[PDB]
Design a protein around this nucleic acid. Sequence first.
RNA 1: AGCAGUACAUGCUAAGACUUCACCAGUCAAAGCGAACUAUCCAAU
Lengths: 102, 95, 354, 92, 55, 144
Amino acid sequence: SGRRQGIKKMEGHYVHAGNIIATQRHFRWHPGAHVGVGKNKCLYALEEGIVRYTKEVYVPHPRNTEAVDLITRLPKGAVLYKTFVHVVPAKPEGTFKLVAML
Amino acid sequence: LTYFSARKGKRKTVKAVIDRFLRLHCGLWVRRKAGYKKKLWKKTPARKKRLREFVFCNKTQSKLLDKMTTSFWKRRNWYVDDPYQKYHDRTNLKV
Amino acid sequence: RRTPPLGPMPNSDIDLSNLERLEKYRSFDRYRRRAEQEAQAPHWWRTYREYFGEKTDPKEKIDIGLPPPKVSRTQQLLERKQAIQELRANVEEERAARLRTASVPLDAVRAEWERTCGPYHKQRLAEYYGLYRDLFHGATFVPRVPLHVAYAVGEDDLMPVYCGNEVTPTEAAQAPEVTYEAEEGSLWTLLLTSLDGHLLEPDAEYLHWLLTNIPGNRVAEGQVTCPYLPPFPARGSGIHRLAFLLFKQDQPIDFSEDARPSPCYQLAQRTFRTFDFYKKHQETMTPAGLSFFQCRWDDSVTYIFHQLLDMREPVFEFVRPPPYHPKQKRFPHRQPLRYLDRYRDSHEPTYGIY
Amino acid sequence: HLATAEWIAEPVRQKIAITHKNKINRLGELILTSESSRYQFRNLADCLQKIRDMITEASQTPKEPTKEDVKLHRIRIENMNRERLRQKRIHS
Amino acid sequence: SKSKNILVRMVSEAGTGFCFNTKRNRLREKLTLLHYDPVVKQRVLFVEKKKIRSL
Amino acid sequence: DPVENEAVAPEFTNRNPRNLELLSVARKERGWRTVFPSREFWHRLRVIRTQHHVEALVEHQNGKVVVSASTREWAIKKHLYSTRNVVACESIGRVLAQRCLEAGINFMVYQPTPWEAASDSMKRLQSAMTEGGVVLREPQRIYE
RNA sequence: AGCAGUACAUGCUAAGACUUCACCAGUCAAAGCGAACUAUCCAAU
Ligand SMILES: [K+]
Ligand SMILES: [Mg+2]
């Protein structure tokens, strides 16, 4: 009676757009640059590139009542940190090619 | 499966397979998803859409379906305005 | 197995013994202000700045411009403080501010801005647009001399160039009117370069205009080292950067090596690199002023190619990489019927041997 | 060669020239291409149909107002701000 | 016999015949909705018609 | 037979940092859904209000500051009775809008908090930007 | 836990992926269109 959830793509792995980076019951890894979130908190790549995991300062949305209450009660000088997953775009959006010589 | 019919001594086709599957001439088998018509009210739009897709069978299933049908069901057909005409032949398949 | 931190861990100075006695943020804004400050700081652990932040030489950018002007801070602070006390003394000023009817003269602000922070804001804009990266290979200068370039559009109108504003090639058909503050006896060089126009070499530029040995503000009397040529950004090639550079010469300079014929309609002869041109004359002239505008193709460009340049107009398109698909498999288990269309090149029916 | 096309009406050739200037080359020849089909017959038929639509569209003077492409929308705002920067010669 | 919610079929007032089942509270009057109607490609009034099942 | 001027590289190299952004094809940094503010923009307007001054910045998503207007500047400060009131915030918007047009910046995103948006200072500052030609909303990216 | 609240674009379509695993089933989803713009057979129709 067990299921498989966790990191599908580890650090430095190459992902294509739409690849599921990780599956989680709760937010253990947060969406970074070019990483989308699903309804079930699934993390997926929005661009083709290399997966990177970093530690970034956490700032919740002002309307996230539950999270805003936490940060307001923190001692001044203390910053919350979380683990974020990013995708570093490997290719350019496009190139300019000569098509005609009018 | 009947390998040798009582009256003709010939292999027989499993008609249960003909009712549920479409065989493309390339060897692929197409089927429907189980329960695509049942209890739609309790299914999300995304689940309902994948339930109405025509999906391919795996290698193991395809070989089993091939044994259960005789050569007549594997012949090339030229039906007029067949919706699956283009899918009968594979393209750009290296393997 | 545990590894000791490779440096000070976050939220470690915080004394946990007297948590209740510590001062809390109490506000989202105060936490956010501290959060942004912490993010900017460098950290031993992996951060977004590492992978996405641009990698640039740690050594400070060389400054190749004119020296900063000398200012007496004590006198400057004295006059400014007295000016504000005079302004605040007026009852009408206080009433206008309280009733929210007061406003600032935009024209007067820009006049003072040009004298004070404008050179440093133009440098920031030039840095953001990559002019220093592409013109002087990363060397930077502060445009101390405000350079005013305007294109006469029609008879009574003028299209100004303000460091990045868009000017169409039609408006730039003729040489612009250039003015700047220059003391008597000074000699200046003015060039116009297209950073993104070159059709053959990625790193090269086109010398659209080059005036040398300009006496003071009399641009017309300066020698025409290269006749003016309108910007011709190719259709579909995007937005091009056109940068006017003003150089303050230290003495008369011989530009025969850089001379070009009149008229010059050969793109090979107008191929230009500002870094190489300045490098040979760095001893005698210093970058003084900077203006630039953004240009994209317009109908007038076609005339330049067919008539002035006597060539066919090149057209470009923005092409994206072909969509990625996984390697096709003989049995695409659980994939929709349309899976076979992803690997199909022709939409028309095929019949094989028949 | 569009300008010297006797079959097309003279008012139409002018309207086609401005509307499809990007297709006309240095020699004044309107160039149409089609590569949508394997067969040359279908490709040629696509080109001829393009010529017919051009002549028809030209003769239909009341061009239908339509919502601009997203690309045009920003260009309209960019063109509007560019005029805002235009100034007048102080002394003329 | 009894349920908190009822499954009922909403029919479009446009007369196209498009209908979708919807959930409403048992102790409520006939439901009317502005649900989207594919046949007309725009939102249209929907009128509750027939009870399908009890949840 | 071959014209000298007609030598053109098959691929055009446009080094203008804003080229793809101006064409609306440059990719915005999507993601960061669980944190504030969003990174999905090319340029954004950021307003910093201190105890004594008001500052408005236009910066690229990469963190570079394109243009800025601040009450600390003498050019603006000398025409202001106070540098911390609504009039100062409105004046900064009018000045920043002019500098934006001169820099070719016509679109940007504004990411305020609920209280900042409601405040009259930001309403007046936003109005000055819109009346100055800045849209305060960016065009969508063109994926196809 | 064998439910409820409460919405009615839980619309259409479509790259790329996940999955208790073997199958069946199940899950996430860019772009686009349109909006908003904040179990099987059987039985009833
Ligand atoms: K180029
Ligand atoms: Mg979408």
